[PDB]
Structure formats: structure tokens, C-alpha cells
Amino acid sequence: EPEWTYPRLSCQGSTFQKALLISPHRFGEARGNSAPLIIREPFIACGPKECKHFALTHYAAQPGGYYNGTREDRNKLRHLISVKLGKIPTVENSIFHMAAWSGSACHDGREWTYIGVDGPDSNALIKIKYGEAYTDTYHSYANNILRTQESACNCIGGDCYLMITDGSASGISKCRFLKIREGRIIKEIFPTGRVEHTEECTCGFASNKTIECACRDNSYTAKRPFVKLNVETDTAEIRLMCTETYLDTPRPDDGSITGPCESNGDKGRGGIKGGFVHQRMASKIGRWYSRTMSKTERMGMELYVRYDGDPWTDSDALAHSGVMVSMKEPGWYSFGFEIKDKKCDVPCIGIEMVHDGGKKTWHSAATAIYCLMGSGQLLWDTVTGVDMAL
Amino acid sequence: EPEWTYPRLSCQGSTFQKALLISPHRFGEARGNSAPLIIREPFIACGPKECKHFALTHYAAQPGGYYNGTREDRNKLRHLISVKLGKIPTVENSIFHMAAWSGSACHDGREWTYIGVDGPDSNALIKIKYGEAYTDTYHSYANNILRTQESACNCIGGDCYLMITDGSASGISKCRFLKIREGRIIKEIFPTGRVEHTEECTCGFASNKTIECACRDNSYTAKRPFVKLNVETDTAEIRLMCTETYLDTPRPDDGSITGPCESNGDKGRGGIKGGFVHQRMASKIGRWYSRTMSKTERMGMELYVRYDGDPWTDSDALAHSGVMVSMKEPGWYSFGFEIKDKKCDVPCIGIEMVHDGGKKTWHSAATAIYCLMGSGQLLWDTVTGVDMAL
Amino acid sequence: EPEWTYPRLSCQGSTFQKALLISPHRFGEARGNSAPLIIREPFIACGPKECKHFALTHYAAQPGGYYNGTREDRNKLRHLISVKLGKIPTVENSIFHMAAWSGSACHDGREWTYIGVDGPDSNALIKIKYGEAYTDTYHSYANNILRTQESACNCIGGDCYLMITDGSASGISKCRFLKIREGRIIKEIFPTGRVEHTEECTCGFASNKTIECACRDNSYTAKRPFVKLNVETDTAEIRLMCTETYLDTPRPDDGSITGPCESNGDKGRGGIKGGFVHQRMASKIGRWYSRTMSKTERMGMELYVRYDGDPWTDSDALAHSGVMVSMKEPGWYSFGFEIKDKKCDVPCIGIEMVHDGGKKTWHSAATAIYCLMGSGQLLWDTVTGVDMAL
Amino acid sequence: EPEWTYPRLSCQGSTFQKALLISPHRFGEARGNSAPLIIREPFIACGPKECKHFALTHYAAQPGGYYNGTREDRNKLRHLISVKLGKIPTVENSIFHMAAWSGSACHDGREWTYIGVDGPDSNALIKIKYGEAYTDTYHSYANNILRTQESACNCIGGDCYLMITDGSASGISKCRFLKIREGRIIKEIFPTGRVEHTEECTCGFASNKTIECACRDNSYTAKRPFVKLNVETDTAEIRLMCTETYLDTPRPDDGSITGPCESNGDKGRGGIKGGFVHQRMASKIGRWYSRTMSKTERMGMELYVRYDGDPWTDSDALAHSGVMVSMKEPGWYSFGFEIKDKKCDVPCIGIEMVHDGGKKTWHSAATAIYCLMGSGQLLWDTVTGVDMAL
Numbered sequence A, B, C, D: 001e002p003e004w005t006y007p008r009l010s011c012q013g014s015t016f017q018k019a020l021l022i023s024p025h026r027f028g029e030a031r032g033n034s035a036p037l038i039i040r041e042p043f044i045a046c047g048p049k050e051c052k053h054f055a056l057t058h059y060a061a062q063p064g065g066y067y068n069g070t071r072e073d074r075n076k077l078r079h080l081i082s083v084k085l086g087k088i089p090t091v092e093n094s095i096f097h098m099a100a101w102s103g104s105a106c107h108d109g110r111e112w113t114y115i116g117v118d119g120p121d122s123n124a125l126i127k128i129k130y131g132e133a134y135t136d137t138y139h140s141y142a143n144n145i146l147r148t149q150e151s152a153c154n155c156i157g158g159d160c161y162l163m164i165t166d167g168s169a170s171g172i173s174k175c176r177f178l179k180i181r182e183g184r185i186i187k188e189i190f191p192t193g194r195v196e197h198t199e200e201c202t203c204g205f206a207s208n209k210t211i212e213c214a215c216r217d218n219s220y221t222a223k224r225p226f227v228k229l230n231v232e233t234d235t236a237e238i239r240l241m242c243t244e245t246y247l248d249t250p251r252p253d254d255g256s257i258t259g260p261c262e263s264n265g266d267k268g269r270g271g272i273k274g275g276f277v278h279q280r281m282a283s284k285i286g287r288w289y290s291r292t293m294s295k296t297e298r299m300g301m302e303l304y305v306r307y308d309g310d311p312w313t314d315s316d317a318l319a320h321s322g323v324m325v326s327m328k329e330p331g332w333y334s335f336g337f338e339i340k341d342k343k344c345d346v347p348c349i350g351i352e353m354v355h356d357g358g359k360k361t362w363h364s365a366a367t368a369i370y371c372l373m374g375s376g377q378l379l380w381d382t383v384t385g386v387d388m389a390l
């Protein structure tokens, strides 16, 4: 039957370029004839032959009559959906996988694992699907909105690896990692180190031995919690990224947090899920990251790179690698993912571009994608082209 | 070729949890751009790779101009349709299998058998289709609305079993079982025992030797007729369920029916198709059941379980195992089905949540799905989210 | 690679029953959200695993703005389209095969052959497609609307067989048969016998040696031209059906044409394509036919059968086998086709039910299907359920 | 694996005939229910089993609210999209391949290569994708709207060739050819000869050793630049076509350009992409070409052919071979492509028929297809049937 997937060396290239924009609300005009789904938290995950574009829908379309409440994060109607990457997630193109207000999914080389969380806030539930079958669940351990990545889980040799977290969005939220094989949790991994608050980890393989994640600390800092998870020992350690180029939003000016790598600094409250993807070369490792152009608002999105070093000890500024979204455009969640070419993996960053008109109208998002290709500098930015009044 | 399906041991787990809501009319607003079909009697049946969500459509969409008559049960337009489970059943997503106002379907491991009943009330006709080909029929034996399950039929080693019945809705309706192989009736089974009214049986495998069904008595009792069909001998016997937890609607208060297990009791007229599925373990069998929260109306739905014992003689109350649909929400027909995982079968109960605004507007239904998933207790309920005025 | 298809013995059964109604305009309401295509001349043809539902579209949808001219038969916009049988031929479900205002198609066991005719009336052109590729053409020989069957062609061992005709609709139109293999015309067959006018032949296999067709004579008679085509010698002979049950519309009363089988009789001018399908048993042959209930109008449709005999010499009345469409409903073109079960062929008759409101509105049709299944008598009729004002 | 594609001898035939019209806006009326995408620069490319119809969309549908700017050629929203040939390119039928305002694509026998150009005018970028993976880029060399073919690239034995150009629309635009294998540029070919302005080349195989292209000169001449690229040596030479039948638009009267074959002539400013395809026979090669009926406007389209000779030195008029589009109808870009039959290749010419109502309304296009089919002469023309006011 198919081989299990492993991370491979990345395809050759030294810059990212604009790849693709999925802007479903370019067709949502009241005079139009389409039914784009209202969604937020999009992410992409690829198998050997295909990529799926996932999101959490509010189970409502534009145009339609169910806009009220689409700016809320959790309720009894949100579902995890997907379409083949390159299709436009409408009512008929999408597949509804499970009721969920937090999600993840990944392919292990043989089948898709789908993860969704739902249940009441004080006692939510991780639910796992392998293909068509519901196979396992995991309980709330801190009884305060158990939740997961909002981006792809990561499989190697049939073992997938997922961050989950539970606890207060303004206080302690210690994450755990689940090791899942054929839809069933075979190991729970309790991290060591700086564990006070880790959520929405964007994870990827640095090698066949290590999974790394750049996460969100919604409570204490604008520096991102950076997980190193050893896949051979199933152990994990977390420490704050030490770079002066703070990747969260909100954040203080770069380099303004004085003290050791561990100092939390200022404007720590609040956060945003950030993009992070690995470029694995024979001798070296590129870590590519994204952050908003604004320090305080979810506007714009810029690309940054650092080759090698130790993200927990390196204070060096990340190298600015191009404007993906200008400050005039929305820049909300961003995530890494990798496309499987024939012999090598292609690193990409996807950007959630939310159309926000506040609670009195529909709330949904476009997804912009940039991927490593060729050499040079990043050339063009992305606009959604959507007028929310139509 | 592919080999034939057999029931396997159920996947590990001890509670049901909210899996999926298919609510097509969340997209049926007059100002929206979708075409959900108007349906009732949904059910799901799965083969080794995928599941199909079936329903009997009135051959009309919302928004549309044919809402009159969609609250009738039988006419010349109703058709059995399906979509792959997970898709919204719209005009374009759906497949129209055959003209029918009562239906069933099941997969034997190699192909789908589809079953539909249409024809005049005094002379209806069972029609069987195997894949694309129409292969056989069975005639009315009591000339009073020949009808079938409204849920999956069941196949073992190539032989599929189906309940059919015929007779008065408020009098005698003696069912029979047809044994069907590659779309042709190879045997008729005439049940013995308590036989005066059995309809809409929800059937599943208790083992490789026994099919059991929890049925509806629309005339005489609020107890469900419980069929035990021996697959090795092709003989069936029926007796009423003796549990004090009466599963029909309408029903008297639990435990108020005095006298031996077979006593009919009061409030027997009327009925509802009920959910029933098996959890097969090595040394134990769980029988999961659903019934409305309201004793007299199709409102709410809760789950019950009992392990082992004999349904025909056990008077004990079933164990309440969670509220799937609150009193506030519609709880109409429910049904069991099993999803095939790699090595084990996952039992589920689906619930038809009818949008009933009376005879003056459209009448259709959402389908909610709960499956055996991990451990603990059932955590959340399902709402349709539909405002019928839009 | 796949085996070539051959006709097999028909599946067991002795009556036809209502199978399926495809009524695309049940969704064409101005307040609805669907795009059913405007079409006429539907027909169905099946391969080993699937059937396609073909029609000639006017390249316009309901609701829409291009109704004017949809009651005309030939123009530069008509195209041959198809969908999988059981889907609803809308703008997005359909596939456009080629520009055509007359068509046919069949599967040879390996690939689909598509035939369409277009060009000016005085010099039209047969065009042949095998799969995706355009492979051959045939010229007009009488320069008066070269045209073909409007129903399936018939393949045996890779050789397909198609009727074409050319000439005046009110005078002589001598047909020819094309023998096509892998999309290319390998033989032209000139019939003998009564050849003055033959068009719209509905053809099928009576055995591996003979193809038979019941055709339309638009000029001279209400008796149908009946072709016997020997597949081993590639020769064909045509004579009028001798039965007193005249199958054309318009027609005189049954049995009123006195004289030998060859007498044309009265009300010969005008015609309609009629259904005809074979039931091949080990020792005997059933010939099933359809005709309108009205003698003069395209209203209603009745089924008739005759086992064995010689249609060219037998004066015997055909046995009435049931009302498929009542006189209150439209009954326009009808055609035979066969569905491939596992070991045997299932004969069916499809009926074009046109929604005709004259030239000031849209003109299109539903397709009703009846197939041989089980024993007894035909039980229920078909209505389109369409109100042309919505 | 699958083996690589090579050009084969063309299928037998001697005239082209009307094959297929894809006219998406026949379904775009404000009162209809469809969503045809607004596109320009359609082209078709085929692999062994299927063909894809590509176009550059403005990421907008009709009816819709984003008609402004759909008459511009380049912006941040244009995307290369495709549907399987035969499908209508709507919002849901289409696949969005990549952000691009100039494109190309071709199949090498194992996978699709997709090519798109986007980026600022002064610094655009060729992006290549192989299946799902983004694999390579090529930068602007003259910093003035780097651009490519708007028609299929061409693969032989795994190596695909593509024309690119860069430079002034009204001055020097020296093209180059890229040789691409599994999505990566393995060679750049710098043509020799008459090189001052070559763009929008329509290229195909004259044999296994030569690719020829008929191109556009937007600055200096109404003669088409004609490329001969030697696949064995990866060298290319360009000279102007010497035929008195000038194929560009605008153009002077046929045969009015005095002096040697290379003379530029008058009315050289402006241009149009032109149809060109090869018919390869054992001892003879036919070169089929299309040009507008009007000498100065994009109206009408007729077909021409010449067998053998050398385009660079032959002054002879080409043979008029039929009117594909009347003067009455729009005739904009045209392109060649070949469909793969079982044993031979079918040459076709497709025509973009733009709906131009000026800058105040939507601007999009229908695609008409003519292919080599049987013998005789071309019989009918194509109309779009679209009323732009609906």
C-alpha cells in the first residue's frame, strides 16, 4: 500500500514569490449567483498528490441571511470543511468533515487525519477522524477552552504530532502534544522549559529528528514560544524566540525588550497565529517567518528569514524578505505548509486576509499563498479585491 | 473481486459524541444562491470506503415555487436521492436513484443495492436496483401501502436482508423480511411471534449469526417490536421490548405499563422510527437507542444504552447516555448505521431534524450525526440553526 | 484493455415498471437558484459501468433571457450535451461534446462514440468523435437536411452501426447505415426493400446476427418502417410493420388500413420517433414498443409487446402493456436503451415529455424511464410536475 | 511510468470543420442563475486522455459587481484558470492555478506544466508549476512587461519549449525560448535572424526535430515573425513570413508590400495573436493559419492553408480554406492545439470571440473550435449568440 511520508530536502530556491489568491468573496455580491462560505482560520495541508484548503465555516454563505454571529469564535454550528486547493470554497464545492470550532488536519502518506474541537468552553473535546471514520477523542485538562493549532499537523513514518492547549487566554495555558497513529492517540507529550502559555503553534519538520513550532503567547509576551520536539525520544522543550524582530501582534518596537532571551517585555497581552516554514538544505536550515506590518493592528504581512543558529539564543534581527500584503490590506493568521514536488518539498506561507466590517455584517477571509521559487527578491503583493458593500 | 462485507467487532470507545450536522436549509434563504432539496426520511449507509447520505426528495428546492404538497408522504414525484456523506444535498450535488416514496439501501462489499417503493397505495411495489441496473420487484401482499425501513438494509457474505411491511397504519401490518443477493430476492422470511404490527425497522448486526431490529408499532403499543433474525436459518421471531424505558413517541410514563412484558399498554396509537445500533465487543454487546425527549411530540432526542441481557425479557430501565437534541429542537426519525474503519466498525446514530412550519410552507429536514468516540460522557447537543422565514 | 461489448440475453422479468424521472425544470423557477438547460431530443446510452443521458441543448438555461427560438429545430447554437444518468442536466453538470442539431452516441465496451450533425440545411454534415478526438465526417447525399437517429447507436465487437437519412421531410428520404469502428466509417450500407422514407430509427440488437429498427415515415404512412440489418453480411432490408396497432402519430384507428402489409393507408403525413427495445430470451424474443395515447397529438404514452413472429408479415394487434404517461401529460419522442447488469441486459424505454407553451416562451423536456423489472403488470404513470408559469 | 509524449503523424483528413463552441456568457443574464467567469486569452492544451481549456480570469463573474477594470490587461487579481474542455468555466467548475496576467501550459505525457507571468511591468516574473508544485522562475531581462505565448507550450521526450519576450510594445521586444524539464529551466535559447520584435508566438511541431511558431510583431510589420527552432541543437532562427497573405491585424492589402521577403511594409503598428497548426503527413506538411476577415479590426476569422515550401521565402498567397467567423462577429486571438487520438494527432484552431462593449461594462470571451475532420470543404460559421445587455 503507499509508503508513509517523511520530510525531504526542500526544492532549490532562495526567495518566495506570490503564488495564488483564493478570494471566495469576489463572487459573493448580492447581484451575483455564487455561494462562498463564511469562514475564518483557513490553513492548507498537502499529501503526495494533492493539497486541501481547510477552514472553519460558520455554516452560512454570502449572500445570505445568517451574518449575525459570524464574528464569534465558538458556537454549535462551526464546522471544519475543505476543498481541493485551487477550488473556491462554496456550499457545493466544500466537504463538511465534522462539527468543530478549532481544527487541524494532515496526511501521513496513506490517509487524512482530521482534528476538530467542540463542546462547551469549560469542557471541550478533541475529536479525531481518520478518513471517514471517527476514531478517538481527548478530554479537556484545564477546563478552559481546549483548542488546537488552526494549521497542519505533521506526520513522519505514520506518526502524526499535534499541539493542543487548554487554559486561560489571559493567564496560564500549558500545551501538550499528541502523537497519533491511524487516527488513535498513542502518546501524550508534556513539554519542559518555558511552559506558562503556548497556543496556536505553527509546526513543521526541521529534520527527520526534530519538529519545531513558532507559537502564540496571548498573555505574557510578544516574543513567540518556540517548541523543539524530538521525534525519536518523544520529548519537547519550549523557550521564547530570542530575536529582536518580535513576531507577535501586538508587539513593542524591535529590539526594545531589554534583558536575557527569556524577558517577556512589553505589550505581551493579545497575539496572532504566525507563519513559519522550514527550508531544509543539505548543510543548512532556513527558518522563514511572517508578521504583520502594523505592530498593533492585523494589517499587512512581511516575510523574514534566518539561516541556522539557535532561535532560543539568537538575538540577531531576522532578515526582511519582502512585503506580501501592504499595510492597506488585512493581514490576520498566517501558517506554513509544504507542497510535495517529485523529489523535494516546496515551503509556502499562507495568509488569512479577513474582511472585517465589525459585527453588523458578515465576517470572512481570503487566503493568499507565497511559496519558495527561484532566486532574487519577492516581487508583488496581494490585495483581496473585495468590496464588502456589494 | 472485492470480498463481501461482514460485521466486525466495533472500534474501542464507551460514549457517543457529536460528529456532524448536515443542515442544507442554512443555505436556502430567498436572498441566497443555493438549491438545497426538500427531503424527509434521511438515512446513511456506508460501504468500505465511503458513506452515502440518502433521503426521499419531493423533487423541489428551497427557494422555489413547489412547496405545496411537501408535507404529504406519498406521490408520483418523490425520489430516492443520495450525496456522498459530507456534501450538502443540492439539486446539482445529488444523484437521483429511482422514483420512490419509501426507501432503503446498503452496500455488500462489491456494489450498492438501492430499494424504493412506489405505486398506488392499494398496490405498491418494492423495486430493487443493483448499481445501475434495475433487477427485481416484490408486490403488495396486503394491499395497504407496502413500505420498508427508511434506513439501511444489511449485508453479510453477499446476502442482504430487508424488512418490508404492508397493512393498515391503525391496524394489522405484518412485516416480512426479503433476502436479496446481487439485487434479486432469493428468499422471503415470515416472522413468528408477536406479529400484529411491525414497521420502519431499524436493523443491524448483533453478531455474524443474528440481525436485530428495533421497530415501530403505529397501532397498538408504545413498546418497540424487537426482531431477532437468525441469518444461518433464515427464520425471524418478534416480541415487544420489555424495558420500562418505552422508546416510541407517543408513549406513557416510563414503567407505567403493568402486566407481563408482552402487555400493549396505553398511548399505543401513533409512532416514530427509532435509532438503534450495536456495539459489538468480544464478550459483551451494547445496544444503543434514541428516543424523543417529549413523550408526545417530535421534540428533543436522547441516547440510552444497555449491555447484554435479552430485550424481550429485561424490564430494567435503559441507562440514559446524553441529550443529543434539546427539547427546543425538532427530533423526528432516527436511525443507526456503522462506518467502516480499517479494522473495526464505528456505530453511529443519525437524527432527522424536521423544519415543520405546517402545510402552508416548505417541509424538509437537517440530519445530525453522533458516533461512538473515545470515553467519558456525551458533551454537546445539536441545533439546526435554521430560521424558516428566510 | 477492456473487452468489446456484445448483446447478451436480457435479465429475467415480464413487465416494465416506472424507474426514474429526470425533470430538470422542477428547478427552473424564476425565484429558484438553478440553471437546467433548455433541450429536446433526449436519449440514454449505456456502457458497462455507467449510462449517459444525452440531449440537444439550445445553449440556454431556465431562468434566462434566450427563450426566443428554442422551439426551432436547427440553428448554429445547438449542441450535443450529456450528464451521467441520474444527475440533472444543468449548465455546470453537463459536458458539451460538439455543435450539433441531430445526434447519437454509443459505447463499444472501450470508448464512447459521439455523433452530431450540423451545417446548412442544403449541405449538412455528420461529425464523429471517439472519446475526445474528432475522427471522421460524412457528407449530405440528398442535400436536404442530412440527419440521424436521436437515440443510441449500437456496437458489437467494436463495430458500431448508425442510421442516417437525407431528403425531404414530405417526400423521399432514403436512409443509409454507417458502420463505424474506433470513430471511423469503415462501410456504408444501402438498404433494400421499402426505402421511400425512413428516419429517426430506434435500433437495437435482436441477436448477435441482427440489428432491428422501428423508424418514422414522416411522409407516407402511420405504419413504422422496420429495418432488419444483418451484421454478418452488412446488408439491410426495410418493410413496413404489418401490425394493426399503428405506432406513429398521427395515425388512423387501429386496423383501419385495409390491404396487404405494404399498404400505406391514411394520415401518413407527420410522425414521431417511437420507442422500441428487445427482450432477448434463450428461446424467444420480445419486441416492446411505445406510442402516444392520442392518435393525433403528442399526449400520453402506452407500452405494447409482441413475442416472436415476423413484424413485416404479422397483422396481429400488439398486446397493450400499461399506461406510462396519461393523456393529460405530454408524450413526445420515445427511445429504447439497455442497461448492463452483471450477467444480463436490462431493456428500458425512455420518454421525452416536452413542456410546450408555444413560441412565446421556453420549450424544453423532462425524460421519464421505464424498465423491464419483475413480473405482473405496469403499476404507475409519470407526470412532470412542472408549472410553466413559474 | 507513463512515457513521454512525442508529435505523431496527423490523423487523416483535408478540411477543417466546426467542432465546438464554449460560450459561457449565454448563461450570464442578470435574471439567470449562473456564474461564468470574466476572462480573456483562452487557449486549449491536451494531454493523452483529456484537454484543458485555460484562460486568464479577472477574478470576477457575470452577473456581478466587479466589471470595472476587466478591459485592462494586467493587474494583481488576474489568474490562470482551467476547466476540462467541454465544461463551462464558471466559479465552481474552474481550478485556479496561479496568479498571472500572461500564461501558457502543456502536458509532457506524465504531468501538466503551467506557466504564468505576474509582477510589476518593469520587473515581471515567469513562474513555472509542475502539477501542484511551484518549481522555478525566470526574471525580466529587458524590464518592460516580460510576457509569454497565451497558448500551449510544446513537449517532446520530456523537454518542453516556451517562447518568452520582453521589451517595448512599440519598439524592440527580443524573444527567447526556455527549455523546461519537469518544471525547471534547463536551457535558454537566444534566437538569431530577424529579431527586433517577436511576441505571442503560437508554436507547434513540424516534425520530431523542428518546432515552428507564427508570432506577432506589434511594432514594425503586418508580416508574422516565423520561428524555426531546432530541437536537436536547441538553436532558433527567425525570419518574417514572405506570403503575400499578411496574417496580422492591422495589415495592408495582400501583396502590396514591395521589395524582398524581409521588407517590413506599412501598417505594421499594432497586432494580434494568430492561429497556426501543423498537419504532418508522411511526405508533406500542411501549415494551417487563421486571420481576421477585417484588415484593421478584430472582426471575422478565416482559414488558410499551404502545403510544403518554406514560409521564409515563399511569396505565394495562401489558399483560402473557409470562413470560420463572419465579419459580423468578433474574431480576436486565435491559437493552434492538437488533440491526441489513439494513433494519430488531430490539429485544431481555436478562436477567442471577445464580447466588447467598451470600458463601461464587462469584457470577456467565448472560445470557438475548428478541427481537421474528413474531406470536402468547411461548411459552417460560428456565432456567440450573446446579447451583452442581458
Ligand SMILES: CC(=O)N[C@H]1[C@H]([C@H](O)[C@H](O)CO)OC(C(=O)O)=C[C@@H]1O
Residues within 6 Å of the ligand: A041, A073, A074, A101, A102, A145, A146, A147, A148, A168, A169, A199, A200, A218, A271, A272
Ligand atoms: C478556540 C478559539 O476560541 N480560538 C480563537 C482564538 C483564541 O481566542 C485566542 O487564541 C486566545 O486563546 O483567537 C482568535 C483571534 O482571532 O485572535 C480566533 C480563534 O477562533
Ligand SMILES: CC(=O)N[C@H]1[C@H]([C@H](O)[C@H](O)CO)OC(C(=O)O)=C[C@@H]1O
Residues within 6 Å of the ligand: B041, B073, B074, B101, B102, B145, B146, B147, B168, B169, B199, B200, B218, B271, B272
Ligand atoms: C410509506 C409512508 O407513508 N410512510 C410514512 C409513515 C407511515 O404513515 C406510518 O409509519 C404508518 O404506516 O409515517 C411517517 C411519519 O412521519 O410518521 C412518514 C412516512 O413517510
Ligand SMILES: CC(=O)N[C@H]1[C@H]([C@H](O)[C@H](O)CO)OC(C(=O)O)=C[C@@H]1O
Residues within 6 Å of the ligand: C041, C073, C074, C101, C102, C145, C146, C147, C148, C168, C169, C199, C200, C218, C271, C272
Ligand atoms: C434534423 C431535424 O430537423 N429534426 C427534427 C425532426 C424533423 O423535422 C422531422 O423528422 C422530418 O424530417 O422533427 C422533429 C419533431 O419534433 O417532429 C424534431 C427534430 O429536431
Ligand SMILES: CC(=O)N[C@H]1[C@H]([C@H](O)[C@H](O)CO)OC(C(=O)O)=C[C@@H]1O
Residues within 6 Å of the ligand: D041, D073, D074, D101, D102, D145, D146, D147, D168, D169, D199, D200, D218, D271, D272
Ligand atoms: C502581457 C500583456 O499585456 N498582454 C496583452 C497584449 C500586449 O499589450 C501586446 O501584445 C503588446 O506587447 O495585447 C493584448 C491585445 O489584445 O492586443 C492583450 C494582452 O493581454
Ligand SMILES: *[C@@H]1O[C@H](CO)[C@@H](O)[C@H](O)[C@H]1NC(C)=O
Residues within 6 Å of the ligand: A006, A007, A008, A009, A207, A208, A280
Ligand atoms: C528522512 O528520512 C527518509 C527515510 O526515512 C529519507 O528518505 C529522507 O530523505 C529524510 N529527510 C531528510 C530531510 O533528511
Ligand SMILES: *[C@@H]1O[C@H](CO)[C@@H](O)[C@H](O)[C@H]1NC(C)=O
Residues within 6 Å of the ligand: B006, B007, B008, B009, B207, B208, B280
Ligand atoms: C464475522 O465473520 C468474518 C469471517 O466470516 C470474521 O472475519 C469476522 O471477524 C466476524 N465478525 C464477528 C463480529 O464475529
Ligand SMILES: *[C@@H]1O[C@H](CO)[C@@H](O)[C@H](O)[C@H]1NC(C)=O
Residues within 6 Å of the ligand: C006, C007, C008, C009, C207, C208, C280
Ligand atoms: C453474443 O456473443 C457473445 C460472444 O461473442 C456471447 O457471449 C453472448 O452471450 C451472445 N449474445 C447473445 C444474445 O446470444
Ligand SMILES: *[C@@H]1O[C@H](CO)[C@@H](O)[C@H](O)[C@H]1NC(C)=O
Residues within 6 Å of the ligand: D006, D007, D008, D009, D207, D208, D280
Ligand atoms: C517522433 O518520434 C517517436 C519516437 O521517438 C515516433 O514514435 C514518432 O512516430 C515520431 N513522430 C514523427 C512525426 O516523426
Ligand SMILES: [Ca+2]
Residues within 6 Å of the ligand: A092, B092, C092, D092
Ligand atoms: Ca453549482
Ligand SMILES: [Ca+2]
Residues within 6 Å of the ligand: A216, A217, A218, A219, A220, A221, A222, A223, A248, A249, A250, A267, A268, A269, A270, A271, A272
Ligand atoms: Ca502576545
Ligand SMILES: [Ca+2]
Residues within 6 Å of the ligand: B216, B217, B218, B219, B220, B221, B222, B223, B248, B249, B250, B267, B268, B269, B270, B271, B272
Ligand atoms: Ca406506537
Ligand SMILES: [Ca+2]
Residues within 6 Å of the ligand: C216, C217, C218, C219, C220, C221, C222, C223, C248, C249, C250, C267, C268, C269, C270, C271, C272
Ligand atoms: Ca407518418
Ligand SMILES: [Ca+2]
Residues within 6 Å of the ligand: D216, D217, D218, D219, D220, D221, D222, D223, D248, D249, D250, D267, D268, D269, D270, D271, D272
Ligand atoms: Ca503588426
